[PDB]
């Protein structure tokens, strides 16, 4: 009894949103390119101590948390499979923003996200095959976008490199560039919120089951907490710990949405078409809440 | 059977870094898996 509004995915508003998101990505990456340095990235890649910790934390906490949340809340097979697919996904590129708002080591946020989206090529089908047994009796190894992952990695690294060279060579226009980036990001965010609201309409009221909301709100917080705790167990300096926490918590959500749609028909998925959106709107909320808490603490310290 | 170019800041299937933006239009050629799975074990808690 769940059906999306007619002609979903092809109306002009959805095209407007899908074009606005690309400008979001380009200008966010260009702005973040004004913080990183090539020499420090080379140092962080030639002395891998926080990078391995980030990889271990992400790929040993997020999939296991997804599996445990599926087995504890007594979810359906399709819901548990969606959660598990949304767990093994790479770190994504919101971790860079959340580690910028918390005074992290930006150069390492780029090593962990590029390396953990290139290790994803190998470790996403492996973890899916290891964990999906007893849930799905099928092949999910040929539906992972390998070529898409590589192309996305290169296309995401391009604007960051542009920003890095701009900072290194011509710092005269850096202030204007960063101000324009911030204002464009703000405008495109105000655009995205209202455009997504109009696009979704009343069809989201069918995708707010208490189990779905509870799991999609408990997964990112547990990711944050466990990433921070495990990074602190290895006595890191206080900034790498926050970067690791905010890279373990945040996930590349679009991969789950493009895998579920390829594997399953629109009627089997049902309300789970909106679960990636719930994950995004809860991880944004938790990131903002933690940023506010951190800044309130830093004021008093 | 999946050549979608994912967008990190995305939450819908039609959020891809393709300049042609053919996913939002008709005949979107990004999922070459016409043999979907209608599996009946999708409402069982086990």
């Amino acid at each position, epitope marked *: 009894n769940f*059906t999306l509004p007619p002609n979903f995915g092809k109306r002009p508003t959805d095209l407007a949103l899908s074009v606005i998101l690309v400008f979001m990505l380009f200008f966010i990456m260009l702005s973040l390119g004004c913080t990183m340095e090539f020499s420090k990235i080379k140092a962080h890649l030639w002395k891998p101590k926080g990078l391995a910790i980030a990889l271990v934390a992400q790929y040993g906490i997020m999939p296991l948390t997804a599996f445990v949340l599926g087995k504890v809340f007594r979810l359906k097979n399709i819901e548990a499979l969606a959660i598990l697919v949304c767990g093994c996904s790479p770190g994504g590129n919101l971790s860079n923003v959340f580690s910028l708002a918390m005074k992290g080591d930006m150069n390492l946020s780029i090593v962990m996200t590029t390396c953990s989206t290139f290790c994803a090529l190998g470790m996403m089908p492996l973890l899916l095959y290891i964990y999906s047994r007893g849930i799905y009796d099928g092949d999910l190894k040929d539906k992972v976008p390998y070529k898409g992952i590589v192309i996305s990695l290169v296309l995401v690294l391009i604007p960051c490199t542009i920003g890095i060279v701009l900072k290194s060579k011509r710092p005269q226009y850096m202030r204007y560039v960063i101000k324009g980036g911030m204002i464009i990001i703000l405008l495109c965010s105000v655009a995205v919120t209202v455009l997504s609201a109009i696009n979704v309409g009343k069809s989201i009221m069918f995708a707010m089951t208490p189990l779905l909301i509870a799991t999609s709100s408990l997964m990112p917080f547990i990711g944050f907490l466990l990433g921070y705790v495990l990074s602190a167990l290895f006595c890191l300096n206080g900034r790498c710990r926050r970067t690791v926490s905010m890279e373990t918590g945040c996930q590349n959500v679009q991969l789950c949405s493009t895998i579920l749609n390829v594997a399953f028909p629109p009627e089997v998925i049902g309300p789970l078409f909106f679960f990636p959106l719930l994950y995004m709107i809860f991880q944004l909320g938790e990131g903002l809440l933690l940023i506010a808490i951190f800044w309130c603490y830093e004021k008093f310290k | 059977t999946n050549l979608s170019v994912p967008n990190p800041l995305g939450f819908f299937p039609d959020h891809q870094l393709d300049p042609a933006f053919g996913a939002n239009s008709n005949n979107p050629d990004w999922d070459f898996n016409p043999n*979907k799975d209608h599996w009946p074990e999708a409402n069982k808690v086990g």
Partner: antibody
Amino acid sequence: VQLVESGGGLVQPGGSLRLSCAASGFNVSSSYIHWVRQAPGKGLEWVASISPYYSYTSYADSVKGRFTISADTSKNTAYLQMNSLRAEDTAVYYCARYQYDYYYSYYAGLDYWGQGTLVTVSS
Amino acid sequence: SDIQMTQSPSSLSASVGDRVTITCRASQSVSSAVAWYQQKPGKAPKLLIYSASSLYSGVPSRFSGSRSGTDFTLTISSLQPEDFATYYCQQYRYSLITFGQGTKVEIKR
């Protein structure tokens, strides 16, 4: 409950023909209408399917890109439109429903079939 | 990419009152989503068994279904003069439905 087909006839190769499936006794807006083709003196074959409620449509491998299936919830009919009919497409076409089982939640046998309209293509 | 079926007996011949066992084997795990049809020559197919073990309403009690992993069987308890026709095997747990080759039960002499 019954399904009726119409539009079977002689079509030259490369031509186009439209088959209608005038469903009666239920509503196509929710059902799952299938088209099944039987070559003369051969076993049954599958052609195309429609799920109008979800607007999800899948075609077989042999007729992918040449056959178009539609639904008309206003007139309670299902249409299969073919293009570039090769000489090997001459057969009898059946319209089939999709039973739903409530005790075990999934689809059941294709209960109701139409009589079938002979589509023969030859120059 | 299609899910092939390998209906084993092609032209099984059995006289009146015997036992008939037609075996359909799926190349991939299709769960319990196999149906058995009985197409008499010159008429539209009917439905006999759905979900590979149940029984469609109106079918006599002679027919039966089974499933052993990926192997599906159809058993006729006692053949009747109206049981001589062609039987097909189907699948559900995949978008592209694939039928079977067909088993023609003919009289013996």
